[PDB]
UniProtKB/Swiss-Prot annotation:
Cited function: Involved in nucleolar processing of pre-18S ribosomal RNA and ribosome assembly.
Free-text comment on this protein's domains from its UniProt entry: The WD repeats are grouped into two tandem seven-bladed beta-propeller regions.
Localization (cell): Nucleus, Nucleolus
Record text on subunit structure and interactions: Interacts with snoRNA U3. Interacts with MPP10. Interacts (via WD repeats) with UTP18. Component of the ribosomal small subunit (SSU) processome composed of at least 40 protein subunits and snoRNA U3.
Chief localisation class: nucleus
Taxonomic lineage from the root: Eukaryota, Fungi, Dikarya, Ascomycota, Saccharomycotina
The gene coding this protein: UTP21
Positions spanned in the full protein: 158 to 684 of 939
Protein name (record): U3 small nucleolar RNA-associated protein 21
Length: 496
RNA sequence: CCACAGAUCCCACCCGGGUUGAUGAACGA
């Protein structure tokens, strides 16, 4: 036990080389040496004026490096009990220390602001500083370690990333890294029909592709200070490699961006609304030839994904267009808006084929291409299912007690699964319109998507950086439910 | 596959040239 007279609050436990049976206990105020075999406190250093936050054994005898709340790294001799050296890092709070051990006498100093500083111990000069490699709001650099005998330093923070930096035989060069979002995913989509990749956007302003396979590989989409946060997303696998196959809408921007799934990078085109409105909805044809953009001012624009050229423009809605889609045969185009209007248009000409007026503002659309049904989420907490061929409402789903966050069709077309602020995930059988299953979660689902094949369900939630995968073990009764809902927990991070 | 480098190239500024010559131009105290 370290009583408060013996030392302060324990910060770190270290074992120095050749210190047989002797544990070094560094506290906020001093450094102790205990013989763990005999129990004897064999050493206690003088009081340290400034709070010690970090400690790290040096690659030479008797020396331990100590970081302080003030940007000081102190080389301390445990045998003689005195300072040997004190390096000052101006106005930084040290969070990690590591010595290079490949021949070069270098020291790395991580900080809470997310900087990684490299210092030459022999030339007594600052070698370099990797600025903002990890987010400060997530603790900055929480750990940075030179690999033993190698010119490689591994770094990490609370921003869900693990980076590796090298020193070529010169400033350090980015080598490789792995990561995900630092904030919960806001929008997701399955990228392909082989269940390989998922496209995922977050409020951390990033666009990522995550593999669904065992290697758990992932890669951020290159934006070559980030683009504003994504507010709508669409992707089609048809033209991968040939031209742009991803469209994103960004917060408070009057144009949509395009991306290339093959090269995992932003694409060539930007698609303007043309009516000075923000982009509120985006969509793509199944063939991959066309991009659709819905404006906050009501306009709908159709662009050519190959050349980037504006093809067609429609003006029906007088409020924000919240959803757009086109049938698999590119015959009939459908739209929805906050004005509660459902628009039906002929794609080959530009004729208004029809209009529906619903009783509440419409916030989102999901179109089922294999059944030509599309569902709409309304502000009155209902889900309206419409047949695109007949241009008629065929079903209306009532049950949710709060705002609907997301929904999707089961691949066959038999089911619709929906999520809400009411912290439920419900399954609706379309032939009856009744809720046949309900799940209560403790972490509200913000997205729900069926895999192209009926096997998996992907969900995103209010808290958590990742995407939850569920197995659809019903590939069932038509009995209605009420408070017989299941209170299920999210999948384990220990699986697979 | 991207990333990043590389050097080149310009490219335009920038400087000097330069209004007290840029150019190329085949010898014979």
């Amino acid at each position: 036990t370290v009583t408060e007279i013996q030392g302060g609050e324990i910060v770190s436990l270290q074992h120095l080389a050749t210190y047989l049976n002797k544990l070094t206990v560094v506290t906020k105020s001093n450094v102790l040496l205990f013989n763990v075999r005999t129990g004897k406190l064999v050493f206690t250093s003088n009081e340290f004026p400034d709070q010690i936050t970090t400690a790290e054994p040096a690659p030479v005898l008797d020396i331990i490096a100590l970081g302080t709340v003030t940007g000081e790294v102190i080389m301390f001799n445990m045998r003689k009990g005195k300072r040997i050296r004190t390096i000052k890092i101006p106005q930084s709070r040290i969070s990690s220390l590591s010595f290079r051990t490949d021949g070069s006498s270098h020291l790395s100093v991580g900080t809470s602001s997310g900087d990684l500083i490299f210092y030459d111990l022999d030339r007594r000069s600052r070698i370099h500083v990797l600025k903002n490699i990890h987010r400060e709001s997530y603790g900055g650099v929480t750990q940075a370690t030179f690999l033993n005998g190698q010119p490689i330093i591994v770094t990490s923070g609370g921003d869900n990333s693990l980076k590796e930096y090298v020193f070529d035989p010169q400033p350090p060069r980015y080598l490789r890294s792995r990561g995900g979002h630092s904030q919960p995913p806001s929008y997701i989509a399955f990228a392909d029909s082989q269940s390989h990749f998922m496209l995922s956007a977050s409020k951390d302003r990033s666009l990522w592709s995550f593999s669904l396979r065992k290697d758990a590989q992932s890669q951020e989409m290159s934006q070559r200070s980030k683009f504003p946060e994504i507010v709508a997303l669409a992707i089609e696998n048809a033209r991968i490699g040939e031209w742009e196959n991803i469209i994103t809408a960004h917060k408070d921007e009057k144009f949509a961006r395009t991306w290339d799934m093959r090269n995992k990078r932003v694409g060539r085109w930007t698609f303007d609304t043309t009516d000075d409105g923000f982009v509120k909805s985006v969509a793509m044809s199944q063939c991959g030839n066309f991009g659709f953009i819905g404006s906050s001012n009501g306009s709908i624009t159709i662009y050519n994904m190959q050349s980037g050229i504006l093809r067609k423009k429609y003006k029906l809605h007088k409020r924000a267009v919240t959803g757009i889609s086109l049938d698999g045969m590119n015959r009939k185009m459908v739209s929805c808006g906050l004005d509660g209007i459902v628009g039906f248009y002929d794609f080959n000409k530009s004729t208004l084929l029809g209009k529906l007026k619903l009783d509440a503002p419409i916030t989102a659309m999901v179109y089922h291409r294999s059944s030509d049904l599309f569902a709409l989420a309304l502000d009155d907490l209902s889900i309206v299912v419409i047949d695109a061929v007949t241009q008629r409402v065929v079903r209306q789903l009532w049950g949710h007690s709060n705002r609907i966050t997301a929904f999707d069709f089961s691949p066959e077309g038999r089911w619709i699964v929906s999520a809400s602020l009411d912290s439920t995930i419900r399954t609706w059988d379309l032939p009856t319109g009744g809720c046949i299953d309900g799940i209560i979660v403790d972490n509200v689902a913000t997205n729900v998507k069926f895999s192209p094949n009926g096997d998996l369900l992907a969900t995103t939630h209010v808290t958590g950086n990742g995407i939850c995968i569920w197995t659809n073990r019903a590939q069932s009764t038509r009995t209605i439910d009420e408070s017989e809902f299941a209170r299920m927990a999210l999948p384990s991070t220990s699986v697979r």
